[PDB]
Amino acid sequence: QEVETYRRSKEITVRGHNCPKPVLNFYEANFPANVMDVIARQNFTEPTAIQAQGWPVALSGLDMVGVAQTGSGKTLSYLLPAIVHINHQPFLERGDGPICLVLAPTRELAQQVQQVAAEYCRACRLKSTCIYGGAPKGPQIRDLERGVEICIATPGRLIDFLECGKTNLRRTTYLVLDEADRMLDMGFEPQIRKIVDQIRPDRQTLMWSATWPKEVRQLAEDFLKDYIHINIGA
Ligand SMILES: Nc1ncnc2c1ncn2[C@@H]1O[C@H](COP(=O)(O)OP(=O)(O)O)[C@@H](O)[C@H]1O
């Protein structure tokens, strides 16, 4: 396995049934033209180790957990397959909720992901929005009502909105839990549960974490299906 040479090099450990081979370069991912336009402008030389192994897993439709240090490039690891997903699901109709739901523990990390996502949404003509607590409800409710394919959210504000019927998850087929361990450290487990229970069963779900403790591992087993576990580090 040329694979095992590459994984071993990049300190990639994979666990679970039938993980696809890692993609050795950007071109092999076969992301659509508009996304490539935006990737070329970032002057990356190469895929990061989790993009390498993570992308093909995500693009295959499989559930997974990606464990890597802050800075290993996981945002793109779930975002970019999200775009492909959206391209393969029907067109967004008046009043449809989001197709892709990215949950994040804090306002700041929610906004970071919106920032990364902005350029690709614009190149791909997708609409997205950052939902977070503390800030004016008005603009956020506007965005959700005009319709977004992508909704990046912190749990509390999302709940409030669902309960008020200002959006809904009956189209959410691609679920992301960024910074899951932090999300659990800050005590959001009941809230994340209350959220997912409203998500139709055929969802692909992807968790991302810098660490792999008991609490997170248990969340994975309750929420994921036959998941792949990717580790990055010695
Ligand atoms: N393929 C790549 N090559 C080089 N840098 C990248 C690549 N993908 C992402 N980056 C950059 O690496 C940094 C870390 O990305 P990020 O998604 O924040 O990682 P994490 O979420 O693991 O902390 C960002 O500044 C991002 O622009």
Residue numbers in the entry: 71 to 304
The authors write:
DExD/H-box RNA helicases, from virus and bacteria to eukaryotes, play important roles in processes including ribosome biogenesis, RNA processing and folding, ribonucleoprotein (RNP) remodeling, RNA nuclear export, the regulation of RNA translation and transcription, and nonsense-mediated RNA decay. DExD/H-box proteins often contain accessory regulatory domains and localization modules, but their cores consist of two RecA-like domains joined by a short flexible linker. The N-terminal domain is commonly referred to as conserved domain-1, or DEAD-domain, and the C-terminal domain as conserved domain-2, or helicase domain. Both domains contribute to the binding site for RNA substrates and both contribute to ATP hydrolysis. We used X-ray crystallography to determine the structures of the DEAD-domains of DDX2A, DDX2B, DDX5, DDX10, DDX18, DDX20, DDX47, DDX52, and DDX53, as well as the helicase domains of DDX25 and DDX41.
DDX5 is a co-regulator of different transcription factors including ERα, p53, MyoD and Runx2, but ATPase/helicase activity is not required for transcriptional co-regulation. DDX5 also participates in pre-RNA processing, alternative splicing, microRNA and ribosomal RNA processing. In the crystal complexes with either ADP or AMP the loop closes up, resulting in a shift in Cα-atom positions by up to 3.5 Å between the ATP- and the AMP-states, or by up to 2.5 Å between the ADP- and the AMP-state. Thus the conformation of the P-loop is determined by the nucleotide phosphates, and longer phosphate tails result in a more open loop. Inspection of the RNA complexes of DDX19, vasa, and eIF4AIII shows that the conserved motif that makes the most extensive contacts with the RNA-backbone phosphates is motif Ib. In two of our DEAD-domain crystal structures, anions from the crystallization buffers are bound to motif Ib (a sulfate in DDX5, and a phosphate in DDX47) highlighting the ability of this motif to bind polyanions.
